[PDB]
Amino acid sequence: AIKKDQKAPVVTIFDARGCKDHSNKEYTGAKAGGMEDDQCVKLTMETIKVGDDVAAKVLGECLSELKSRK
Amino acid sequence: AIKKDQKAPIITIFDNRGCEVKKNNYSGAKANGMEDDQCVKLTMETITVSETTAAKKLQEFIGLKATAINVPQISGVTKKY
Amino acid sequence: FSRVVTAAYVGGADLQALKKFVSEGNKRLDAVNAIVSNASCIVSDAVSGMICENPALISPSGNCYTNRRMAACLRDAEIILRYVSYSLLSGDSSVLEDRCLSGLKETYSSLGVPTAGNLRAVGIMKATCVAFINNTSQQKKLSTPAGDCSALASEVAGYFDKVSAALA
Amino acid sequence: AAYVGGADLQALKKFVSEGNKRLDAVNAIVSNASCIVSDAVSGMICENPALISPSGNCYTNRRMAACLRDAEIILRYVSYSLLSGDSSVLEDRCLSGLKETYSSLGVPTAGNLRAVGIMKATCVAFINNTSQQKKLSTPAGDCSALASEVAGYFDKVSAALA
Ligand SMILES: *CCC1=C(C)C(=O)N/C1=C\c1[nH]c(/C=C2\N=C(C[C@H]3NC(=O)C([C@H](*)C)=C3C)C(C)=C2CCC(=O)O)c(CCC(=O)O)c1C
Ligand SMILES: *CCC1=C(C)C(=O)N/C1=C\c1[nH]c(/C=C2\N=C(C[C@H]3NC(=O)C([C@H](*)C)=C3C)C(C)=C2CCC(=O)O)c(CCC(=O)O)c1C
Ligand SMILES: *[C@@H](C)C1=C(C)C(=O)N/C1=C\c1[nH]c(/C=C2N=C(/C=C3\NC(=O)C(CC)=C3C)C(C)=C\2CCC(=O)O)c(CCC(=O)O)c1C
Ligand SMILES: *[C@@H](C)C1=C(C)C(=O)N/C1=C\c1[nH]c(/C=C2N=C(/C=C3\NC(=O)C(CC)=C3C)C(C)=C\2CCC(=O)O)c(CCC(=O)O)c1C
Ligand SMILES: *[C@@H](C)[C@H]1/C(=C/c2[nH]c(/C=C3N=C(/C=C4\NC(=O)C(CC)=C4C)C(C)=C\3CCC(=O)O)c(CCC(=O)O)c2C)NC(=O)[C@@H]1C
Ligand SMILES: *[C@@H](C)[C@H]1/C(=C/c2[nH]c(/C=C3N=C(/C=C4\NC(=O)C(CC)=C4C)C(C)=C\3CCC(=O)O)c(CCC(=O)O)c2C)NC(=O)[C@@H]1C
Ligand SMILES: *[C@H](C)[C@H]1/C(=C/c2[nH]c(/C=C3N=C(/C=C4\NC(=O)C(CC)=C4C)C(C)=C\3CCC(=O)O)c(CCC(=O)O)c2C)NC(=O)[C@@H]1C
Ligand SMILES: *[C@H](C)[C@H]1/C(=C/c2[nH]c(/C=C3N=C(/C=C4\NC(=O)C(CC)=C4C)C(C)=C\3CCC(=O)O)c(CCC(=O)O)c2C)NC(=O)[C@@H]1C
């Protein structure tokens, strides 16, 4: 059943092959010996929130594009 | 010179031909024509981006690979400047 | 990933193993990347398309009147999109049905959140995600190696269909 | 707020070139403003990821917000230049003094040049209806002059910040 806490999984995909300037310290499991050592998936569970700024800007777009009838 | 109040013109385009809702924001002379159903709104307001939004956009950007459909690709993996 | 739902970092040998536990692991991760990295647009395009086709939704009588209501609607569309993105990552709809859809229709009925608008918002998001996966752009205008992702697209389409069925 | 409708709007349309088409072109920007800003700041960053490294200028929510904000400010003054048919307000209220502000803060020039370039390309595609999404319906015709005019406005931004 929905928890009514508005929390949802937030997935981030890091295809970091060739990137050197970030310290790959977040994954602490064994290495693959392959390209996956430069690749990482992150998952967190977060309260999904929408700021008033976005609510107002999306409304502003909407008001600029109500479909004409003719 | 920029005022450093971060205010910019917000323009809304109302082409509301065929809309049955009556609005009275415009107080000038009538067109007796299509422009009685059309309006341009202009305000000058502080442009605001919340830190909630900035956090959410960072998460969308931080993969550094995905794009809109059918657009040029310029992504990289090194510092350019 | 069950732990986090009920921060995880899967990389290296864990990621290598994860890819052999789902079908088409690499393409699946590309599809997730396309969806989550465009989430704000996907969500606002669906909610604003719902509205531009039925402007009464932001009339004083409409359910999306006021920033607070518009924010709640945009939020819900994003909640749905994220649980669909999780279903694509995990290869199944269990968490989507249990944590996103079970009890939602009754919640919307009690709130007066309109069914017609919800179905249209979901339907626009579905079409958008399917198009991101079945993207036939020329390679120079595509972030992934060009190829066939039609099976993944059908799978994501089915997850959106579970949303629509729960809300109708 | 100012509301220009009815006979005042007929006058506006007559006092600029290609009035009705110009409003379609303006609407192609403002009805897509959040996507335009997103593509520009995101592409700036994917080209140069150092911008969101722990020391980069877009690091932290406060700075990211300011950058997203500035891209929108620039975009909106360009949209106003297109509505009015000239760049006087853009130059006076958006560009004059902005390069020294950015130099004092350390806001990187090459980043602004990339963001502005993406915004220009995106606006031109929406105006000409060659974008992937074509949500605004127009009668068929040639809008290349309006597209070139807005391209000129973005180039004045680039010229002022370069
Ligand atoms: C706003 C989203 C959108 C919809 C919806 C639509 O239909 N088109 C949309 C966006 C759009 N983007 C461009 C052009 C560019 N976008 C980028 C940034 C992305 N490329 C990356 O590599 C990257 C990081 C991974 C991005 C994010 C770039 C670089 C361009 C090209 C800019 C240039 O100077 O040419 C357009 C214009 C497309 C066209 O010209 O046909 C549109 C419409
Ligand atoms: C915003 C994310 C995005 C990026 C980035 C990109 O490159 N394409 C993107 C979006 C996208 N949207 C659709 C389909 C639809 N979008 C809408 C809403 C808009 N249409 C309106 O009339 C309107 C108010 C004026 C809008 C806002 C609609 C209605 C659809 C069609 C849904 C359907 O039933 O088919 C797509 C799908 C591909 C396409 O071009 O249709 C995509 C990728
Ligand atoms: C038809 C598209 C429609 C239906 C159907 C519906 O239920 N609601 C509809 C439209 C609608 N309009 C607005 C807000 C504004 N409309 C404006 C247009 C004009 N104002 C005028 O004075 C004239 C005559 C020249 C117009 C053509 C303007 C300026 C609007 C904004 C007012 C403001 O600044 O607040 C909405 C939003 C909700 C509302 O105000 O009713 C809707 C839903
Ligand atoms: C290369 C693209 C790059 C340059 C150049 C630069 O200046 N910054 C660059 C990358 C970058 N990465 C990140 C954040 C994360 N990168 C992650 C990747 C991995 N972590 C690992 O352990 C492994 C091994 C399997 C990875 C491939 C992760 C997980 C990141 C998120 C960290 C978090 O959630 O806290 C950034 C953001 C800023 C930073 O932390 O460095 C940048 C700019
Ligand atoms: C439909 C989804 C789109 C499409 C996808 C496509 N991708 C590939 C190949 C690869 N994709 C990846 C991506 C990742 N692997 C990871 O571990 C991670 C980080 C978590 C990512 C982002 C990889 C590694 C590959 C292998 C090739 C490479 O090393 O670059 C293909 C090719 C076929 C295949 O299965 O390998 C395809 C078709 N292509 C499209 O056109 C659709 C829009
Ligand atoms: C380039 C921008 C695209 C293009 C535009 C195009 N538009 C028209 C005709 C009209 N455009 C409008 C738009 C508005 N008028 C308003 O008052 C408002 C609200 C403020 C809007 C949004 C209208 C009303 C018309 C019809 C005018 C009439 O009297 O019939 C054309 C036709 C040529 C012309 O100059 O009228 C064109 C070419 N078309 C494209 O294909 C490009 C993608
Ligand atoms: C947008 C497309 C539609 C719309 C949405 C709308 N929803 C609400 C309020 C609620 N939505 C939820 C949904 C969830 N809670 C969860 O925990 C989960 C799963 C993780 C979901 C999907 C809930 C619980 C509420 C009420 C409580 C709350 O907001 O915290 C609103 C506001 C309703 C009101 O009367 O205030 C709106 C506007 N509205 C539309 O018109 C579109 C069709
Ligand atoms: C984003 C593409 C780029 C970038 C942006 C960035 N800007 C700032 C700070 C400021 N920006 C302005 C700009 C204006 N103020 C105005 O009144 C107007 C005209 C209406 C404009 C254009 C100003 C005044 C500031 C400073 C004051 C303030 O923000 O309130 C920042 C923050 C700088 C800091 O160190 O805190 C940033 C990050 N940064 C980039 O990396 C991109 C190239």
Residue numbers in the entry:
A (entry chain C): 1 to 70
B (entry chain A): 1 to 81
C (entry chain D): 5 to 10, 16 to 177
D (entry chain B): 16 to 177
Quoted passage from the original study:
In addition to their membrane‐bound chlorophyll a/c light‐harvesting antenna, the cryptophyte algae have evolved a unique phycobiliprotein antenna system located in the thylakoid lumen. The basic unit of this antenna consists of two copies of an αβ protomer where the α and β subunits scaffold different combinations of a limited number of linear tetrapyrrole chromophores. While the β subunit is highly conserved, encoded by a single plastid gene, the nuclear‐encoded α subunits have evolved diversified multigene families. By careful examination of three newly determined crystal structures in comparison with three previously obtained, we show how the α subunit amino acid sequences control chromophore conformations and hence spectral properties even when the chromophores are identical.
The crystal structure of PC630 from Chroomonas gentoftensis CCAC1627 was determined at 1.8 Å resolution. The structure shows a closed form cryptophyte PBP. This protein is very similar to the previously examined PC645 from “Chroomonas” sp. CCMP270 (RMSD 0.324 Å over 2732 atoms). Although the chemical structures of all the chromophores are identical between PC645 and PC630, a careful examination of structural details showed that the key difference between them was a twist along the bond between pyrrole ring D and ring C in the PCB attached to β82. In PC630, Gln6 in both αL and αS makes a side chain hydrogen bond to the nitrogen atom in pyrrole ring D of the β82 chromophore. In contrast, Gln6 of PC630 is replaced by Leu5 in each α subunit of PC645. Leu5 sterically prevents pyrrole ring D of chromophore β82 adopting the same orientation as all other cryptophyte structures. Thus, the sequence of the α subunit N‐terminal segment dictates the twist of pyrrole ring D of the β82 phycocyanobilin (PCB) chromophore and hence the spectral difference between PC630 and PC645. The α19 chromophore on PC630 αL shows a very slight bowing between pyrrole rings B and C, which is not present in any of the other α19 chromophores in PC630 or PC645. This is likely to be due to sequence differences in the chromophore loop of PC630 αL that result in the disruption of a conserved salt bridge that stabilizes the conformation of the α chromophore (see Section 2.8).
